[PDB]
Structure 1
Amino acid sequence: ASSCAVQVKLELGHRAQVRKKPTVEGFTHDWMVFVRGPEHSNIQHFVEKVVFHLHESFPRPKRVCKDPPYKVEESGYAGFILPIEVYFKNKEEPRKVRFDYDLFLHLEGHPPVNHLRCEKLTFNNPTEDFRRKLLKA
């Protein structure tokens, strides 16, 4: 007869800059995409791994990060939808959360992309293990 509601704050984001010189393959942008916690918080306490599903046109498109930083750097020629799966150190439903991230690129002659997307997860009545893992962040 008592309730719990844990709330964690995640930050998804990405930067994208037009290359001074495009690569031999025609890639014209350097971009990086990241998942992190605010103000250098340590989300590893409850995040097992983070999976970046790149477009099929990329070699080894399913990138995995088991340790911080949860980022992917790459060079490319067009934007796309990047599914990001965040897996928690949870043994109960739900193990991970999915985010469809709009990784867009701006044209040359425009200021580079520095995009931020704040997300906020609320877990209700979790297990005590997951609870203390979540609350150590």
Structure 2
Amino acid sequence: GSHMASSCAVQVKLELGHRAQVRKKPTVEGFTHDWMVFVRGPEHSNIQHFVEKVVFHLHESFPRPKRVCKDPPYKVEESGYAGFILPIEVYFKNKEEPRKVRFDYDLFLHLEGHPPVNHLRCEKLTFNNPTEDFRRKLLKA
């Protein structure tokens, strides 16, 4: 608000995730490893309140590596045969400070035969003294 005496920092929590599992029988183009990525907020905290859209920059070896998510649970499901750093972007709803955050999530896949991959990690964005519109959405989250 515009009546600030104590500096308030509102923190939003975004979560990077991905699973990986191998099919013993690759696809036509020989892609063996199937995975799925996650960008969202913690359980009960909805990012769709302060978050607008989302984008994934997979590797160029992947058809249309940039996957955009303008909907609920933001994710990507693809198949390949290697891991890599995947620069993920979450778009924020603001006219103020950066309207995007880029999370370089490490896409690791497990060896053929026994792949258990289910990883989720949580990032923190603290906004010191944000405008009401921003504060307001961050609170609704």
What TM-score results when the alignment is normalised by the length of structure 1? 0.94
Query: Which stretch shows the higher mean deviation, 32-41 or 72-81?
Result: 32-41
Q: Which of 85, 93, 96 in structure 1 is aligned with 2:97?
A: 93
- Seen in structure 2, the aligned counterparts of structure 1 residues 62 and 47 have a Cα distance that, compared at 3 Å, is same
Q: Is structure 2 residue 14 aligned with structure 1 residue 10?
A: yes
How many residues are matched? Answer: 137
- What aligned pairs does 1:67-106 form with structure 2 within 5 A after superposition? 67-106=71-110
How far is 1:94 from its partner? 1.5
Please give the alpha-carbon distance, in whole angstroms, between the structure 1 residues aligned to 2:40 and 2:24: 28
Which segments of 5 or more consecutive residues in structure 1 lack a partner in the other structure?
A: none
Secondary structure (helix, strand or coil) at the match of 1:101 reads: strand
Report % sequence identity. Answer: 100
**CA shift digits 1:88-120 (9 cap, x unpaired):** 101111211111110011102334211121111
- Computed over aligned residues only, the root mean square deviation of the Cα atoms, in angstroms, reads 1.2
Counterpart contact for 1:18–1:112, Cα < 8 Å: no
Equivalent pair of 2:109/2:115 in contact (CA under 8 Å): no
Could you tell me how far 1:40 is from its partner in structure 2? 4.4
The alignment partner of 2:89 has SS state of: strand
Counterpart of 1:113? 117
- CA shift, 1:83, in A, is 0.4
Q: CA deviation at 1:2?
A: 2.9
Query: For structure 1, which segment, 106-115 or 116-125, has the greater mean C-alpha deviation from structure 2 after superposition?
Result: 106-115
Which secondary structure state, in structure 2, belongs to the residue aligned with residue 115 of structure 1?
A: strand
User: 1:17·1:30 contact (CA, 8 Å) conserved in 2?
Assistant: yes
**After TM superposition, what 4+ stretches of structure 1 lie above 6 angstroms from structure 2?**
none
